[PDB]
């Protein structure tokens, strides 16, 4: 889409115009944003589940619809296959959505039990309107790529358990790298543009881009 | 990428030179070839496992290495990250490969449906015959795409459980469609080039190509 091309433009921008370096940029930031902390791929039966930094649980179903359980664990936002948003308590759900609500609770409680948080990025205070949802995702043999409505871009790698997140804060683009020890380092794209980067963050930046294209 | 580019050349070939139609080409061929009957994605822990029509079980590990278990469940083929082939029994496996061997058996035993008496149990001829393996795969919210050693090309869709397989038996290109009700129909690409096809098989061919690109 237009969102995907925008992120890919700036990611490529920073990539072939950045110096060669020894280490990751020393200028790092202490802010919190929205990102995927836990994820679950059950696409062969139901769909793709993810948990956000504010503890929102979402499901991108195979039929195309979105379902989100809010941090209060009571309220459900449901966007259908064409985009009609319905908001209703999860406890008493219309009998059209019960099947989907059940699966949504199932994802929400698989993640908390079996799965572990992926980074020490500070839990976020929540609100932006409209609310974030996953517009598309794709998986290769090397990495998991997720792109959201608001343009936040995340790629998870399997073996290293390393991650890259590209977000928009105020007027800047941020790149956050999450290393082998689940630890957050956040840069500005501008600073990474002029100051270069490490060998293994640049390899991961190169790969994240190939997934977008 | 040479393999992918070959399939993409002829598939785009047939796609941009085919009429628009209402129905499927009637001139069909009846043969069977090698394709994936079972697949299992555990990429964040092990890798991607698959079972072939000839009862070979393969694992594409996240690191890029391939490991194949022969139909007899006795012999292990190990192709290294770019193609160094190692062959050894699973019972007697070099202790360099165990971690990888164990995982291959784990997939092999997931592949195992519940055991039901019956015959004939699959058996191997040559203990050293280079069987095709997965070169790379990609998954979207709609489909799984797999590209193999010999250039065999397969796209599985989730909700429909519908499949497309592009093969080269020689040295012509075949497209096999396996529809919503489990029925295989195999055409020649030349036939699909000149006569067009159904509305959404053309839509499924279009999606398969976009996944390659
Ligand atoms: Cl068209
Ligand atoms: Cl397990």
Short mmCIF file of C-alpha atoms and ligand atoms in Angstrom, two decimals:
data_model
loop_
_atom_site.label_atom_id
_atom_site.label_comp_id
_atom_site.label_asym_id
_atom_site.label_seq_id
_atom_site.Cartn_x
_atom_site.Cartn_y
_atom_site.Cartn_z
CA UNK A 1 0.00 0.00 0.00
CA UNK A 2 0.91 3.67 0.39
CA UNK A 3 2.01 3.10 3.98
CA UNK A 4 4.35 0.25 3.01
CA UNK A 5 5.96 2.34 0.26
CA UNK A 6 6.47 5.30 2.56
CA UNK A 7 8.37 3.28 5.16
CA UNK A 8 10.37 1.51 2.45
CA UNK A 9 11.35 4.83 0.89
CA UNK A 10 12.81 6.19 4.12
CA UNK A 11 14.37 2.87 5.14
CA UNK A 12 16.15 2.72 1.77
CA UNK A 13 16.88 6.43 2.11
CA UNK A 14 18.77 5.98 5.35
CA UNK A 15 20.42 2.77 4.12
CA UNK A 16 22.37 3.68 0.98
CA UNK A 17 23.21 7.15 2.29
CA UNK A 18 24.66 6.10 5.66
CA UNK A 19 28.42 5.88 6.37
CA UNK A 20 30.26 2.70 7.34
CA UNK A 21 30.80 2.26 11.08
CA UNK A 22 32.22 0.32 14.01
CA UNK A 23 29.31 0.37 16.40
CA UNK A 24 25.68 1.42 16.75
CA UNK A 25 25.17 5.22 17.11
CA UNK A 26 25.95 6.57 20.57
CA UNK A 27 23.04 9.00 20.44
CA UNK A 28 20.15 6.97 21.82
CA UNK A 29 16.73 8.01 23.09
CA UNK A 30 14.53 7.28 26.09
CA UNK A 31 10.95 7.35 24.85
CA UNK A 32 8.17 4.78 24.64
CA UNK A 33 5.97 3.94 21.66
CA UNK A 34 3.58 1.24 20.46
CA UNK A 35 5.01 -2.08 19.25
CA UNK A 36 4.39 -5.84 19.23
CA UNK A 37 5.72 -7.53 22.36
CA UNK A 38 4.24 -11.00 21.85
CA UNK A 39 3.07 -12.69 18.65
CA UNK A 40 1.32 -15.92 17.67
CA UNK A 41 0.99 -17.40 14.19
CA UNK A 42 -1.97 -19.75 13.82
CA UNK A 43 -2.77 -18.82 10.24
CA UNK A 44 -3.55 -22.37 9.14
CA UNK A 45 -6.61 -22.52 11.40
CA UNK A 46 -7.56 -19.05 12.66
CA UNK A 47 -5.09 -16.25 11.94
CA UNK A 48 -2.34 -14.06 13.33
CA UNK A 49 -2.31 -12.94 16.96
CA UNK A 50 -0.21 -10.22 18.53
CA UNK A 51 0.12 -8.35 21.82
CA UNK A 52 0.92 -4.64 21.91
CA UNK A 53 2.97 -2.52 24.32
CA UNK A 54 -0.22 -1.33 26.02
CA UNK A 55 -1.42 -4.94 26.46
CA UNK A 56 -3.93 -4.78 23.61
CA UNK A 57 -4.47 -8.17 21.98
CA UNK A 58 -5.29 -8.29 18.28
CA UNK A 59 -6.20 -10.97 15.76
CA UNK A 60 -5.91 -10.62 12.00
CA UNK A 61 -8.24 -13.39 10.84
CA UNK A 62 -7.83 -15.33 7.59
CA UNK A 63 -11.16 -14.01 6.29
CA UNK A 64 -9.68 -10.51 6.52
CA UNK A 65 -11.39 -9.13 9.63
CA UNK A 66 -9.66 -7.50 12.60
CA UNK A 67 -10.44 -8.06 16.27
CA UNK A 68 -8.83 -6.26 19.19
CA UNK A 69 -9.22 -6.82 22.92
CA UNK A 70 -8.49 -3.62 24.84
CA UNK A 71 -6.23 -3.47 27.93
CA UNK A 72 -9.32 -3.51 30.17
CA UNK A 73 -9.82 -7.09 28.94
CA UNK A 74 -13.53 -6.29 28.62
CA UNK A 75 -14.04 -4.27 25.45
CA UNK A 76 -13.71 -5.54 21.88
CA UNK A 77 -13.13 -3.53 18.72
CA UNK A 78 -14.12 -5.51 15.63
CA UNK A 79 -13.44 -4.44 12.07
CA UNK A 80 -15.06 -6.75 9.53
CA UNK A 81 -13.81 -7.94 6.14
CA UNK A 82 -14.75 -4.63 4.54
CA UNK A 83 -14.26 -2.23 7.46
CA UNK A 84 -17.37 -1.86 9.60
CA UNK A 85 -16.23 -1.30 13.17
CA UNK A 86 -18.42 -2.74 15.91
CA UNK A 87 -17.65 -2.09 19.57
CA UNK A 88 -19.19 -4.25 22.27
CA UNK A 89 -18.30 -5.89 25.58
CA UNK A 90 -16.63 -9.29 25.28
CA UNK A 91 -18.61 -10.78 28.16
CA UNK A 92 -21.94 -10.41 26.36
CA UNK A 93 -21.21 -10.75 22.65
CA UNK A 94 -23.67 -10.90 19.72
CA UNK A 95 -23.92 -14.52 18.51
CA UNK A 96 -22.27 -13.56 15.23
CA UNK A 97 -18.98 -12.76 16.93
CA UNK A 98 -18.78 -15.34 19.73
CA UNK A 99 -16.68 -17.76 17.66
CA UNK A 100 -14.21 -14.97 16.87
CA UNK A 101 -14.21 -13.63 20.45
CA UNK A 102 -13.39 -17.10 21.78
CA UNK A 103 -10.39 -17.37 19.45
CA UNK A 104 -9.35 -13.85 20.49
CA UNK A 105 -9.38 -14.86 24.15
CA UNK A 106 -7.51 -18.02 23.18
CA UNK A 107 -4.71 -16.00 21.60
CA UNK A 108 -4.68 -13.60 24.54
CA UNK A 109 -4.14 -16.41 27.03
CA UNK A 110 -1.71 -18.47 24.97
CA UNK A 111 0.57 -15.44 24.88
CA UNK A 112 0.50 -14.69 28.60
CA UNK A 113 1.06 -18.31 29.61
CA UNK A 114 3.53 -19.78 27.09
CA UNK A 115 5.05 -16.67 25.49
CA UNK A 116 7.53 -14.08 26.80
CA UNK A 117 7.89 -10.33 26.13
CA UNK A 118 10.38 -9.48 23.39
CA UNK A 119 11.96 -6.22 24.54
CA UNK A 120 12.56 -3.83 27.41
CA UNK A 121 10.85 -0.97 25.60
CA UNK A 122 8.78 0.80 28.28
CA UNK A 123 5.11 -0.18 28.40
CA UNK A 124 3.22 2.54 26.60
CA UNK A 125 0.37 4.82 27.59
CA UNK A 126 -2.13 4.00 24.92
CA UNK A 127 -4.18 6.44 22.92
CA UNK A 128 -4.12 7.43 19.27
CA UNK A 129 -7.35 7.83 17.24
CA UNK A 130 -8.09 5.82 15.10
CA UNK A 131 -6.60 2.92 17.08
CA UNK A 132 -3.73 0.83 15.73
CA UNK A 133 -4.39 -2.47 14.00
CA UNK A 134 -2.35 -4.82 11.80
CA UNK A 135 -2.97 -4.07 8.11
CA UNK A 136 -0.69 -6.86 6.84
CA UNK A 137 2.09 -9.26 7.77
CA UNK A 138 4.34 -11.70 5.93
CA UNK A 139 6.79 -14.38 7.02
CA UNK A 140 9.90 -15.83 5.42
CA UNK A 141 12.30 -18.55 6.58
CA UNK A 142 14.38 -15.87 8.31
CA UNK A 143 12.06 -13.21 9.74
CA UNK A 144 8.55 -12.03 10.63
CA UNK A 145 7.43 -8.69 9.23
CA UNK A 146 4.44 -6.66 10.47
CA UNK A 147 3.08 -3.34 9.20
CA UNK A 148 0.34 -1.38 10.96
CA UNK A 149 -2.19 1.29 9.93
CA UNK A 150 -0.15 4.13 11.43
CA UNK A 151 3.03 3.09 9.65
CA UNK A 152 4.85 1.49 12.56
CA UNK A 153 7.08 -1.17 11.02
CA UNK A 154 8.41 -4.21 12.86
CA UNK A 155 10.59 -7.15 11.85
CA UNK A 156 11.32 -10.07 14.18
CA UNK A 157 14.20 -12.47 13.54
CA UNK A 158 13.95 -16.04 14.81
CA UNK A 159 17.42 -17.33 15.77
CA UNK A 160 18.87 -14.16 17.29
CA UNK A 161 15.49 -13.27 18.75
CA UNK A 162 16.39 -9.79 17.50
CA UNK A 163 13.97 -7.13 16.31
CA UNK A 164 13.77 -3.87 14.38
CA UNK A 165 11.00 -1.30 14.82
CA UNK A 166 10.46 1.79 12.69
CA UNK A 167 7.99 4.28 14.14
CA UNK A 168 6.82 7.88 13.79
CA UNK A 169 6.91 9.86 17.04
CA UNK A 170 6.50 13.61 16.63
CA UNK A 171 8.01 14.63 13.31
CA UNK A 172 10.85 12.07 13.19
CA UNK A 173 11.32 8.46 12.16
CA UNK A 174 12.77 6.22 14.84
CA UNK A 175 14.61 2.95 14.43
CA UNK A 176 14.70 0.71 17.46
CA UNK A 177 16.98 -2.31 17.55
CA UNK A 178 16.32 -5.07 20.06
CA UNK A 179 19.37 -7.25 20.52
CA UNK A 180 20.03 -10.86 21.52
CA UNK A 181 19.45 -9.99 25.18
CA UNK A 182 15.99 -8.50 24.63
CA UNK A 183 17.47 -5.01 25.19
CA UNK A 184 16.20 -1.77 23.56
CA UNK A 185 18.34 0.82 21.76
CA UNK A 186 16.44 3.59 19.94
CA UNK A 187 17.90 5.98 17.36
CA UNK A 188 16.70 8.72 15.07
CA UNK A 189 16.75 7.79 11.39
CA UNK A 190 18.50 11.11 10.71
CA UNK A 191 21.27 10.27 13.19
CA UNK A 192 21.67 6.80 11.68
CA UNK A 193 21.73 8.46 8.28
CA UNK A 194 24.81 10.56 9.05
CA UNK A 195 26.60 8.48 11.70
CA UNK A 196 26.48 5.04 10.10
CA UNK A 197 25.92 1.79 11.96
CA UNK A 198 27.13 -1.61 13.18
CA UNK A 199 27.65 -4.64 10.94
CA UNK A 200 24.76 -6.71 12.26
CA UNK A 201 22.16 -3.97 12.63
CA UNK A 202 22.84 -2.94 9.04
CA UNK A 203 22.42 -6.51 7.84
CA UNK A 204 19.10 -6.62 9.65
CA UNK A 205 18.13 -3.25 8.20
CA UNK A 206 18.92 -4.57 4.72
CA UNK A 207 16.79 -7.66 5.25
CA UNK A 208 13.82 -5.81 6.73
CA UNK A 209 13.76 -3.75 3.54
CA UNK A 210 13.73 -6.80 1.26
CA UNK A 211 10.66 -7.98 3.16
CA UNK A 212 8.88 -4.69 2.53
CA UNK A 213 9.68 -4.78 -1.19
CA UNK B 1 17.26 -16.43 -7.07
CA UNK B 2 17.90 -18.03 -10.45
CA UNK B 3 15.30 -20.69 -9.70
CA UNK B 4 12.68 -18.15 -8.61
CA UNK B 5 13.40 -16.04 -11.68
CA UNK B 6 12.82 -19.01 -13.99
CA UNK B 7 9.36 -19.73 -12.59
CA UNK B 8 8.58 -16.02 -12.60
CA UNK B 9 9.54 -15.68 -16.27
CA UNK B 10 7.15 -18.32 -17.58
CA UNK B 11 4.34 -17.60 -15.11
CA UNK B 12 4.36 -13.91 -16.03
CA UNK B 13 4.66 -15.10 -19.63
CA UNK B 14 1.45 -17.12 -19.46
CA UNK B 15 -0.23 -14.43 -17.37
CA UNK B 16 0.22 -11.37 -19.59
CA UNK B 17 -0.62 -13.27 -22.79
CA UNK B 18 -3.80 -15.05 -21.74
CA UNK B 19 -7.35 -14.10 -22.73
CA UNK B 20 -10.07 -13.30 -20.22
CA UNK B 21 -12.50 -16.16 -19.70
CA UNK B 22 -15.46 -17.74 -17.94
CA UNK B 23 -14.23 -21.32 -17.66
CA UNK B 24 -11.28 -23.72 -17.38
CA UNK B 25 -9.33 -25.19 -20.33
CA UNK B 26 -10.82 -28.59 -21.15
CA UNK B 27 -7.64 -30.02 -22.63
CA UNK B 28 -6.09 -31.51 -19.52
CA UNK B 29 -3.26 -33.88 -18.65
CA UNK B 30 -3.26 -36.66 -16.04
CA UNK B 31 0.07 -37.26 -14.29
CA UNK B 32 1.31 -36.97 -10.71
CA UNK B 33 4.45 -35.20 -9.60
CA UNK B 34 6.15 -34.23 -6.35
CA UNK B 35 4.47 -31.68 -4.12
CA UNK B 36 3.89 -30.83 -0.45
CA UNK B 37 1.11 -32.75 1.27
CA UNK B 38 1.82 -31.57 4.82
CA UNK B 39 3.54 -28.44 6.12
CA UNK B 40 4.28 -27.16 9.62
CA UNK B 41 5.63 -23.74 10.56
CA UNK B 42 7.60 -23.58 13.82
CA UNK B 43 10.07 -20.93 12.70
CA UNK B 44 10.63 -19.22 16.05
CA UNK B 45 11.77 -22.48 17.65
CA UNK B 46 12.88 -24.96 15.01
CA UNK B 47 12.21 -24.03 11.40
CA UNK B 48 9.85 -25.01 8.60
CA UNK B 49 8.87 -28.66 8.23
CA UNK B 50 7.28 -30.26 5.19
CA UNK B 51 6.26 -33.69 3.91
CA UNK B 52 6.42 -34.56 0.22
CA UNK B 53 4.16 -36.70 -1.97
CA UNK B 54 6.88 -39.36 -1.92
CA UNK B 55 6.80 -39.38 1.91
CA UNK B 56 10.07 -37.53 2.35
CA UNK B 57 10.11 -35.24 5.38
CA UNK B 58 12.19 -32.08 5.10
CA UNK B 59 13.19 -29.26 7.42
CA UNK B 60 14.33 -25.83 6.30
CA UNK B 61 16.05 -24.51 9.40
CA UNK B 62 16.11 -20.78 10.07
CA UNK B 63 19.89 -20.68 9.54
CA UNK B 64 19.48 -21.70 5.91
CA UNK B 65 20.57 -25.32 6.19
CA UNK B 66 18.40 -28.15 4.89
CA UNK B 67 17.81 -31.52 6.42
CA UNK B 68 15.85 -34.32 4.82
CA UNK B 69 14.54 -37.58 6.26
CA UNK B 70 14.07 -40.33 3.68
CA UNK B 71 10.70 -42.15 3.38
CA UNK B 72 12.16 -45.19 5.18
CA UNK B 73 12.72 -43.07 8.31
CA UNK B 74 16.21 -44.56 8.32
CA UNK B 75 18.38 -42.31 6.14
CA UNK B 76 19.15 -38.63 6.66
CA UNK B 77 20.21 -36.28 3.89
CA UNK B 78 21.92 -33.12 5.06
CA UNK B 79 22.43 -30.37 2.55
CA UNK B 80 24.48 -27.55 4.07
CA UNK B 81 23.51 -23.85 3.75
CA UNK B 82 24.32 -23.58 0.04
CA UNK B 83 24.46 -27.26 -0.91
CA UNK B 84 27.12 -29.45 0.75
CA UNK B 85 25.32 -32.81 0.94
CA UNK B 86 25.89 -35.11 3.92
CA UNK B 87 24.27 -38.55 4.01
CA UNK B 88 23.92 -40.72 7.12
CA UNK B 89 21.45 -42.95 9.00
CA UNK B 90 19.37 -41.27 11.71
CA UNK B 91 20.00 -44.20 14.04
CA UNK B 92 23.72 -43.68 13.55
CA UNK B 93 24.05 -39.94 13.08
CA UNK B 94 27.32 -38.00 13.32
CA UNK B 95 27.21 -36.13 16.63
CA UNK B 96 27.82 -32.90 14.78
CA UNK B 97 24.26 -32.98 13.53
CA UNK B 98 22.17 -34.32 16.47
CA UNK B 99 20.51 -31.07 17.53
CA UNK B 100 19.43 -30.77 13.93
CA UNK B 101 18.63 -34.50 13.72
CA UNK B 102 16.42 -34.38 16.80
CA UNK B 103 14.45 -31.48 15.36
CA UNK B 104 14.01 -33.35 12.07
CA UNK B 105 12.58 -36.32 13.97
CA UNK B 106 10.29 -33.98 15.92
CA UNK B 107 8.85 -32.68 12.66
CA UNK B 108 8.74 -36.23 11.30
CA UNK B 109 6.58 -37.29 14.23
CA UNK B 110 4.28 -34.27 13.95
CA UNK B 111 3.84 -35.30 10.31
CA UNK B 112 2.68 -38.63 11.65
CA UNK B 113 -1.09 -38.68 11.71
CA UNK B 114 -2.54 -41.16 14.14
CA UNK B 115 -1.43 -44.59 13.12
CA UNK B 116 -4.02 -46.69 11.39
CA UNK B 117 -3.43 -50.18 10.04
CA UNK B 118 -2.97 -50.16 6.29
CA UNK B 119 -0.64 -50.57 3.34
CA UNK B 120 1.62 -50.30 1.75
CA UNK B 121 3.96 -48.57 4.19
CA UNK B 122 6.28 -46.26 2.20
CA UNK B 123 9.75 -47.67 1.46
CA UNK B 124 12.91 -46.30 -0.14
CA UNK B 125 14.77 -47.67 -3.16
CA UNK B 126 18.15 -45.88 -3.21
CA UNK B 127 19.49 -44.78 0.18
CA UNK B 128 21.41 -42.09 -1.68
CA UNK B 129 19.13 -40.42 -4.21
CA UNK B 130 19.17 -36.60 -4.20
CA UNK B 131 15.58 -35.72 -3.30
CA UNK B 132 14.29 -32.20 -3.88
CA UNK B 133 14.26 -29.81 -0.93
CA UNK B 134 12.84 -26.43 0.03
CA UNK B 135 14.99 -23.53 -1.17
CA UNK B 136 12.85 -20.82 0.39
CA UNK B 137 9.29 -20.10 1.48
CA UNK B 138 7.05 -17.13 2.19
CA UNK B 139 3.76 -16.72 4.02
CA UNK B 140 1.18 -13.97 3.84
CA UNK B 141 -2.15 -13.68 5.65
CA UNK B 142 -3.67 -15.37 2.60
CA UNK B 143 -1.17 -17.93 1.31
CA UNK B 144 1.99 -19.97 1.76
CA UNK B 145 4.46 -20.03 -1.10
CA UNK B 146 7.20 -22.64 -1.44
CA UNK B 147 9.95 -22.86 -4.03
CA UNK B 148 12.04 -26.01 -4.34
CA UNK B 149 15.43 -27.34 -5.39
CA UNK B 150 14.25 -28.47 -8.82
CA UNK B 151 12.20 -25.33 -9.42
CA UNK B 152 8.88 -26.84 -8.39
CA UNK B 153 6.58 -24.02 -7.34
CA UNK B 154 3.68 -24.36 -4.90
CA UNK B 155 1.20 -21.92 -3.38
CA UNK B 156 -1.25 -23.03 -0.69
CA UNK B 157 -4.18 -20.82 0.36
CA UNK B 158 -5.46 -21.08 3.94
CA UNK B 159 -9.22 -20.56 4.09
CA UNK B 160 -10.08 -22.31 0.84
CA UNK B 161 -7.36 -24.98 1.27
CA UNK B 162 -6.76 -24.47 -2.44
CA UNK B 163 -3.41 -25.06 -4.15
CA UNK B 164 -1.45 -24.34 -7.32
CA UNK B 165 1.62 -26.29 -8.39
CA UNK B 166 3.90 -25.37 -11.26
CA UNK B 167 6.18 -28.19 -12.32
CA UNK B 168 8.63 -28.96 -15.05
CA UNK B 169 8.26 -32.46 -16.43
CA UNK B 170 10.08 -32.30 -19.50
CA UNK B 171 10.71 -29.90 -20.59
CA UNK B 172 7.33 -28.30 -20.58
CA UNK B 173 5.62 -26.37 -17.81
CA UNK B 174 2.61 -27.81 -16.05
CA UNK B 175 0.18 -26.03 -13.78
CA UNK B 176 -1.80 -28.23 -11.42
CA UNK B 177 -4.86 -26.80 -9.73
CA UNK B 178 -6.26 -28.53 -6.67
CA UNK B 179 -9.57 -26.90 -5.88
CA UNK B 180 -11.79 -26.21 -2.88
CA UNK B 181 -13.16 -29.76 -3.06
CA UNK B 182 -9.82 -31.60 -3.22
CA UNK B 183 -9.86 -32.25 -6.97
CA UNK B 184 -6.60 -32.01 -8.93
CA UNK B 185 -6.71 -30.65 -12.48
CA UNK B 186 -3.45 -30.41 -14.42
CA UNK B 187 -2.87 -28.26 -17.49
CA UNK B 188 0.01 -27.27 -19.70
CA UNK B 189 1.16 -23.66 -19.41
CA UNK B 190 0.92 -23.34 -23.20
CA UNK B 191 -2.74 -24.36 -22.98
CA UNK B 192 -3.34 -21.79 -20.25
CA UNK B 193 -1.54 -19.23 -22.40
CA UNK B 194 -3.88 -19.58 -25.36
CA UNK B 195 -7.24 -20.41 -23.82
CA UNK B 196 -7.40 -18.41 -20.61
CA UNK B 197 -8.90 -19.91 -17.45
CA UNK B 198 -11.58 -19.48 -14.79
CA UNK B 199 -11.99 -16.06 -13.20
CA UNK B 200 -10.43 -16.78 -9.81
CA UNK B 201 -7.90 -19.41 -10.89
CA UNK B 202 -6.46 -16.51 -12.86
CA UNK B 203 -6.76 -14.53 -9.64
CA UNK B 204 -4.88 -17.28 -7.80
CA UNK B 205 -2.18 -17.36 -10.47
CA UNK B 206 -1.90 -13.59 -10.17
CA UNK B 207 -1.43 -13.85 -6.41
CA UNK B 208 1.17 -16.60 -6.72
CA UNK B 209 3.26 -14.44 -9.05
CA UNK B 210 3.04 -11.39 -6.78
CA UNK B 211 4.38 -13.60 -3.99
CA UNK B 212 7.40 -14.55 -6.06
CA UNK B 213 8.12 -10.91 -6.82
CL1 LIG C 1 -6.91 -9.10 -15.62
CL1 LIG C 2 7.24 -28.60 22.20
#
